[PDB]
Write an enzyme that holds these catalytic residues in place. Structure first.
Site, PDB file in Angstrom:
ATOM      1  N   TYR A  83       0.802  -1.219   0.000  1.00 20.83           N
ATOM      2  CA  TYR A  83       0.000   0.000   0.000  1.00 20.83           C
ATOM      3  C   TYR A  83       0.839   1.276   0.000  1.00 20.83           C
ATOM      4  CZ  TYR A  83      -3.579  -3.387   1.327  1.00 20.83           C
ATOM      5  OH  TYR A  83      -4.423  -4.473   1.368  1.00 20.83           O
TER       6      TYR A  83
ATOM      7  N   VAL B  10       5.844   1.813   5.398  1.00 22.17           N
ATOM      8  CA  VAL B  10       5.771   0.930   6.557  1.00 22.17           C
ATOM      9  C   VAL B  10       6.885   1.271   7.545  1.00 22.17           C
ATOM     10  CG1 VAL B  10       5.756  -1.447   7.378  1.00 22.17           C
ATOM     11  CG2 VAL B  10       4.827  -0.909   5.120  1.00 22.17           C
TER      12      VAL B  10
ATOM     13  N   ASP C  13      -0.891 -14.382  -3.876  1.00 24.75           N
ATOM     14  CA  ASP C  13       0.409 -13.736  -4.035  1.00 24.75           C
ATOM     15  C   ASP C  13       1.429 -14.189  -2.991  1.00 24.75           C
ATOM     16  OD1 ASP C  13       1.971 -11.874  -5.602  1.00 24.75           O
ATOM     17  OD2 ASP C  13       1.958 -10.547  -3.854  1.00 24.75           O
TER      18      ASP C  13
END
EC number: 2.7.11.24
Length: 337
Positions: free
Chosen positions: A24, A27, A137
């Site tokens: 996304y 992190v 994935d």
């Protein structure tokens, strides 16, 4: 306050430190002042794109429902009070020491570790598939490790319920079904990925490192050999099916010629997992019962989902705004109070 970008995780989470990127987005590692430990925090800003809303909400629901030793869990979810104010979402997870990607690139792996690591992946995957969920994935970078060699599956962003054209870091671990656009792929795609991972644990190098789309199949067919027409069973692209038959007949390379120092038992399982035909590919439950994993196999200590999964609505049809409301309601749990 971190790398230019804002990180509003306080006051509970402090002592921020950059780790890497998404998935996304950004992190970081932070010290949980409450649980008195360090944690991993993913920052997500999915409210612009429609697909990002799908992937964010899908991972939230799945992971919050799941509860397994070999699967990462969501400890906390920080977001703004009101819905208009919420532009970012912070997922808090256990801070793992390293991953399988970092480990394999630098250090050699013993057979007992390879065997132990393989067992945990399949054990976790068993819980996944029993919940009728496809990770889709799996890869060494999605397998986190700690000090005591405990393995945990992560990043369920591209996950769905077993019944794309987006970007990915790597396509080396995808099954030929995906490559051939086989609409109706099943749990067999995860098995294939774990197969590629097994192979990489043995030789410390990727088994099918294709430079691009078509080159990926050349590496696969190069090792496994050319497929028959029966292997071409599913409703696949007519042109892709013809193209595959038009390619020169390649011969199957014996696994022991690729992996001479590898255990014969591991190579046997590796074979069953990396079969071209999706239906002839071994299932997770049968893969655990394989003689190679007999040292760790224990059906009594391998939990499953109490009931298979099913989302209330199809998120693919819902717009960008209704998905935000779904995210807003799903994250309502962690809001005080």
């Amino acid at each position: 306050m971190v790398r230019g970008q804002v990180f509003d995780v306080g006051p509970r989470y402090t002592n921020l430190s950059y780790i890497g990127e998404g998935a996304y987005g950004m992190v970081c590692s932070a010290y949980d002042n409450v649980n008195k430990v360090r944690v991993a925090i993913k920052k997500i800003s999915p409210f612009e794109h429609q697909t990002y809303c799908q992937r964010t909400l899908r991972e939230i629901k799945i992971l919050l429902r799941f509860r397994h030793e070999n699967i990462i869990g969501i400890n906390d979810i920080i977001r703004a009070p009101t819905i208009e104010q919420m532009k970012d979402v912070y997922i808090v997870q256990d801070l793992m020491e390293t991953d399988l990607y970092k480990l394999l690139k630098t250090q050699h792996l013993s057979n007992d570790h390879i065997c132990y690591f393989l067992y945990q992946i399949l054990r976790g995957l068993k819980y996944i598939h029993s919940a009728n969920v496809l990770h889709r994935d799996l890869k060494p970078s999605n397998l986190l490790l700690n000090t005591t060699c405990d393995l945990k599956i992560c990043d369920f962003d591209l996950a769905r319920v077993a019944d794309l054209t987006e970007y990915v870091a790597t396509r080396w671990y995808r099954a030929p079904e995906i490559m051939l656009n086989s609409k109706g792929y099943t749990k067999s795609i995860d098995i294939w990925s774990v197969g590629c991972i097994l192979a990489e644990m043995l030789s410390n190098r990727p088994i099918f490192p294709g430079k691009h789309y078509l080159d990926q199949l050349n590496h696969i067919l190069g090792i496994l050999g050319s497929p028959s027409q029966e292997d071409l069973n599913c409703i696949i692209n007519l042109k892709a099916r013809n193209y595959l038959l038009s390619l020169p007949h390649k011969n199957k390379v014996p696994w022991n010629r690729l992996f001479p120092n590898a255990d014969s038992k591991a190579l046997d399982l590796l074979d069953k997992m990396l079969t071209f035909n999706p239906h002839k590919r071994i299932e997770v439950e049968q893969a655990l019962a394989h003689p190679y994993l007999e040292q760790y196999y224990d059906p009594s200590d391998e939990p499953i989902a109490e009931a298979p999964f099913k989302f209330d609505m199809e998120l693919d049809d819902l717009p960008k705004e209704k998905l935000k409301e779904l995210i807003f309601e799903e994250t309502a749990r962690f809001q005080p109070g």
